[PDB]
Amino acid sequence: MSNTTWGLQRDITPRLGARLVQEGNQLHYLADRASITGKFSDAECPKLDVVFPHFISQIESMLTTGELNPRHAQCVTLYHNGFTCEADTLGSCGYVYIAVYPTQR
């Protein structure tokens, strides 16, 4: 638990989130608006940093290709490079809450 938390107020297993704000045909990702958990070595930091744009490169398209339309919530589970990110619109208008949880095993 924490007094102030950027993403949704959750301290369960997925205690890390990354809610993006809608604006124009692109989404603004603010580094100062997130939290870090655990620790990534110098050999894991660069390798993970290059994987980040891969997953985001798809989100920017999901709203277009997946046809964005505030109507109802729809949970989708993607899988790439062994890593799996979860995304959902929650049926919210002009808002998409997303979260990443790297596989341990």
PDB file of C-alpha atoms in Angstrom:
ATOM      1  CA  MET A   1       0.000   0.000   0.000  1.00  0.00           C
ATOM      2  CA  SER A   2       1.046   3.643  -0.547  1.00  0.00           C
ATOM      3  CA  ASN A   3      -0.381   7.100   0.186  1.00  0.00           C
ATOM      4  CA  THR A   4       0.024   8.225  -3.474  1.00  0.00           C
ATOM      5  CA  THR A   5       0.133   5.895  -6.547  1.00  0.00           C
ATOM      6  CA  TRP A   6       0.218   6.950 -10.229  1.00  0.00           C
ATOM      7  CA  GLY A   7      -1.669   4.028 -11.782  1.00  0.00           C
ATOM      8  CA  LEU A   8      -4.745   2.436 -10.212  1.00  0.00           C
ATOM      9  CA  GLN A   9      -4.619   2.030  -6.402  1.00  0.00           C
ATOM     10  CA  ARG A  10      -3.542  -1.649  -6.234  1.00  0.00           C
ATOM     11  CA  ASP A  11      -0.924  -3.405  -4.015  1.00  0.00           C
ATOM     12  CA  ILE A  12      -1.845  -6.969  -5.053  1.00  0.00           C
ATOM     13  CA  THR A  13       0.691  -9.123  -7.065  1.00  0.00           C
ATOM     14  CA  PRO A  14       0.470  -6.759 -10.148  1.00  0.00           C
ATOM     15  CA  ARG A  15       1.543  -3.730  -8.047  1.00  0.00           C
ATOM     16  CA  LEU A  16       3.052  -2.100 -11.168  1.00  0.00           C
ATOM     17  CA  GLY A  17       0.893  -0.328 -13.797  1.00  0.00           C
ATOM     18  CA  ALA A  18       1.213   2.269 -16.560  1.00  0.00           C
ATOM     19  CA  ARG A  19      -2.001   4.152 -17.462  1.00  0.00           C
ATOM     20  CA  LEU A  20      -1.549   6.227 -20.671  1.00  0.00           C
ATOM     21  CA  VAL A  21      -3.524   9.401 -21.508  1.00  0.00           C
ATOM     22  CA  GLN A  22      -5.290   9.724 -24.888  1.00  0.00           C
ATOM     23  CA  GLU A  23      -4.427  12.765 -27.036  1.00  0.00           C
ATOM     24  CA  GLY A  24      -4.373  13.118 -30.841  1.00  0.00           C
ATOM     25  CA  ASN A  25      -3.373   9.996 -32.818  1.00  0.00           C
ATOM     26  CA  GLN A  26      -0.531   9.204 -30.351  1.00  0.00           C
ATOM     27  CA  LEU A  27      -0.291   8.380 -26.611  1.00  0.00           C
ATOM     28  CA  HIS A  28       1.982  10.348 -24.243  1.00  0.00           C
ATOM     29  CA  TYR A  29       4.168   8.064 -22.053  1.00  0.00           C
ATOM     30  CA  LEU A  30       5.504  10.054 -19.054  1.00  0.00           C
ATOM     31  CA  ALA A  31       8.525   8.395 -17.385  1.00  0.00           C
ATOM     32  CA  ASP A  32       8.020  10.467 -14.223  1.00  0.00           C
ATOM     33  CA  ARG A  33       4.536   8.853 -14.071  1.00  0.00           C
ATOM     34  CA  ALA A  34       5.365   5.250 -13.127  1.00  0.00           C
ATOM     35  CA  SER A  35       6.937   3.041 -10.416  1.00  0.00           C
ATOM     36  CA  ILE A  36       9.812   0.500 -10.491  1.00  0.00           C
ATOM     37  CA  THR A  37       9.714  -2.865  -8.635  1.00  0.00           C
ATOM     38  CA  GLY A  38      12.493  -5.384  -7.948  1.00  0.00           C
ATOM     39  CA  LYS A  39      15.738  -4.732  -9.847  1.00  0.00           C
ATOM     40  CA  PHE A  40      17.119  -5.271 -13.387  1.00  0.00           C
ATOM     41  CA  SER A  41      20.853  -5.904 -13.858  1.00  0.00           C
ATOM     42  CA  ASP A  42      22.945  -4.001 -16.399  1.00  0.00           C
ATOM     43  CA  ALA A  43      22.474  -7.035 -18.722  1.00  0.00           C
ATOM     44  CA  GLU A  44      18.656  -7.053 -18.130  1.00  0.00           C
ATOM     45  CA  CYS A  45      18.010  -3.283 -18.193  1.00  0.00           C
ATOM     46  CA  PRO A  46      19.083  -2.706 -21.901  1.00  0.00           C
ATOM     47  CA  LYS A  47      17.514  -6.008 -23.028  1.00  0.00           C
ATOM     48  CA  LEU A  48      14.166  -5.040 -21.396  1.00  0.00           C
ATOM     49  CA  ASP A  49      14.344  -1.393 -22.550  1.00  0.00           C
ATOM     50  CA  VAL A  50      14.513  -2.492 -26.225  1.00  0.00           C
ATOM     51  CA  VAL A  51      11.501  -4.827 -25.637  1.00  0.00           C
ATOM     52  CA  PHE A  52       9.386  -1.930 -24.240  1.00  0.00           C
ATOM     53  CA  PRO A  53       8.838  -0.147 -27.673  1.00  0.00           C
ATOM     54  CA  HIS A  54       7.938  -3.549 -29.195  1.00  0.00           C
ATOM     55  CA  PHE A  55       4.866  -3.869 -26.941  1.00  0.00           C
ATOM     56  CA  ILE A  56       4.022  -0.131 -27.217  1.00  0.00           C
ATOM     57  CA  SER A  57       4.413  -0.287 -31.016  1.00  0.00           C
ATOM     58  CA  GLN A  58       1.361  -2.617 -30.912  1.00  0.00           C
ATOM     59  CA  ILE A  59      -0.800  -0.511 -28.525  1.00  0.00           C
ATOM     60  CA  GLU A  60      -0.637   2.531 -30.817  1.00  0.00           C
ATOM     61  CA  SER A  61      -2.014   0.183 -33.541  1.00  0.00           C
ATOM     62  CA  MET A  62      -4.595  -1.630 -31.330  1.00  0.00           C
ATOM     63  CA  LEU A  63      -6.684   1.534 -31.066  1.00  0.00           C
ATOM     64  CA  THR A  64      -6.644   1.769 -34.889  1.00  0.00           C
ATOM     65  CA  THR A  65      -6.423  -1.833 -36.089  1.00  0.00           C
ATOM     66  CA  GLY A  66      -8.382  -3.168 -33.079  1.00  0.00           C
ATOM     67  CA  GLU A  67     -10.859  -0.404 -33.891  1.00  0.00           C
ATOM     68  CA  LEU A  68     -11.301   1.768 -30.758  1.00  0.00           C
ATOM     69  CA  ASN A  69     -14.957   2.271 -29.734  1.00  0.00           C
ATOM     70  CA  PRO A  70     -15.996   3.002 -26.054  1.00  0.00           C
ATOM     71  CA  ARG A  71     -18.797   0.368 -25.782  1.00  0.00           C
ATOM     72  CA  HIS A  72     -17.761  -2.339 -23.309  1.00  0.00           C
ATOM     73  CA  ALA A  73     -14.738  -3.753 -21.477  1.00  0.00           C
ATOM     74  CA  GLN A  74     -12.683  -6.419 -23.305  1.00  0.00           C
ATOM     75  CA  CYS A  75      -9.655  -8.127 -21.710  1.00  0.00           C
ATOM     76  CA  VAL A  76      -6.928  -9.243 -24.186  1.00  0.00           C
ATOM     77  CA  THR A  77      -3.773 -11.303 -23.396  1.00  0.00           C
ATOM     78  CA  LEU A  78      -0.832 -10.800 -25.819  1.00  0.00           C
ATOM     79  CA  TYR A  79       2.365 -12.925 -25.904  1.00  0.00           C
ATOM     80  CA  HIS A  80       5.737 -12.026 -27.505  1.00  0.00           C
ATOM     81  CA  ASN A  81       9.406 -12.799 -26.744  1.00  0.00           C
ATOM     82  CA  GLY A  82       8.174 -15.043 -23.903  1.00  0.00           C
ATOM     83  CA  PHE A  83       6.893 -11.898 -22.140  1.00  0.00           C
ATOM     84  CA  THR A  84       3.103 -11.295 -21.913  1.00  0.00           C
ATOM     85  CA  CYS A  85       1.433  -7.864 -21.331  1.00  0.00           C
ATOM     86  CA  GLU A  86      -2.290  -7.469 -20.349  1.00  0.00           C
ATOM     87  CA  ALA A  87      -4.450  -4.595 -21.722  1.00  0.00           C
ATOM     88  CA  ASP A  88      -8.116  -3.537 -21.440  1.00  0.00           C
ATOM     89  CA  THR A  89     -10.357  -0.488 -22.142  1.00  0.00           C
ATOM     90  CA  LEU A  90     -12.620  -1.187 -19.116  1.00  0.00           C
ATOM     91  CA  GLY A  91     -15.271   0.330 -21.439  1.00  0.00           C
ATOM     92  CA  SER A  92     -13.892   3.758 -20.488  1.00  0.00           C
ATOM     93  CA  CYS A  93     -14.173   6.728 -22.892  1.00  0.00           C
ATOM     94  CA  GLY A  94     -10.759   8.032 -24.030  1.00  0.00           C
ATOM     95  CA  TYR A  95      -8.772   5.960 -21.498  1.00  0.00           C
ATOM     96  CA  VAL A  96      -6.886   2.621 -21.618  1.00  0.00           C
ATOM     97  CA  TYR A  97      -5.410   1.038 -18.446  1.00  0.00           C
ATOM     98  CA  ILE A  98      -2.427  -1.317 -19.111  1.00  0.00           C
ATOM     99  CA  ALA A  99       0.001  -3.314 -16.956  1.00  0.00           C
ATOM    100  CA  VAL A 100       3.135  -5.439 -17.477  1.00  0.00           C
ATOM    101  CA  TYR A 101       4.254  -8.397 -15.308  1.00  0.00           C
ATOM    102  CA  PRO A 102       7.425 -10.205 -16.631  1.00  0.00           C
ATOM    103  CA  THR A 103       7.312 -14.002 -16.231  1.00  0.00           C
ATOM    104  CA  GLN A 104       9.495 -15.194 -13.329  1.00  0.00           C
ATOM    105  CA  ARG A 105      10.027 -18.843 -14.329  1.00  0.00           C
TER     106      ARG A 105
END
